[PDB]
Design a protein around this nucleic acid. Structure first.
Ligand SMILES: [Zn+2]
Ligand SMILES: [Zn+2]
Ligand SMILES: [Zn+2]
Ligand SMILES: [Zn+2]
Lengths: 70, 66
DNA sequence: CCTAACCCTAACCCTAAC
DNA sequence: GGTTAGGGTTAGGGTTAG
């Protein structure tokens, strides 16, 4: 049947797999108003804001996402 | 009472020993099976292996840290 | 807290030169 | 021939995001 990729589980339907491997990736849902960087956690955005507190024109590169676990 | 591990100092409360373990500079716990260099981070070992593939006979010396 | 990864920099090595 | 300094190389660690 439908096989996944990130971890490898035998699934039934194609719609039961999207809701599964969709939560496998953290969604970027928190945007910095200063530099437009979108974060996966609110804590990451707060911690980020503590940088603009002491750096002019800070605009960091968008890093690769890291796979979650389930 | 409970003693330490890395250095091995005598410690009373456990929280003190924890926050002491937090600050220890260079803990080399990532060893290269190819040449023996003990790296302080895994990423440094990943960076080392690439050198171990660029050339053959490579056995560097354990540096003094900062 | 952890780690990953960029990145600058000190520590290293080899050797020419003094 | 001891000893030092220069240029290429590599590991240490600061920093910051996932
Ligand atoms: Zn999966
Ligand atoms: Zn920002
Ligand atoms: Zn210790
Ligand atoms: Zn090695």
């Amino acid at each position: 049947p439908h096989f996944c990729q990130i971890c490898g589980k035998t699934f039934k339907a194609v719609e039961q797999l999207r809701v599964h491997v969709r939560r496998h990736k953290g969604v970027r849902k928190f945007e910095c108003t200063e530099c437009g960087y979108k974060f996966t956690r609110q804590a990451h955005l707060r911690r980020h804001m503590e940088i603009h507190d002491r750096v002019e024109n800070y605009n960091p590169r968008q890093r690769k996402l890291r796979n979650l676990i389930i």
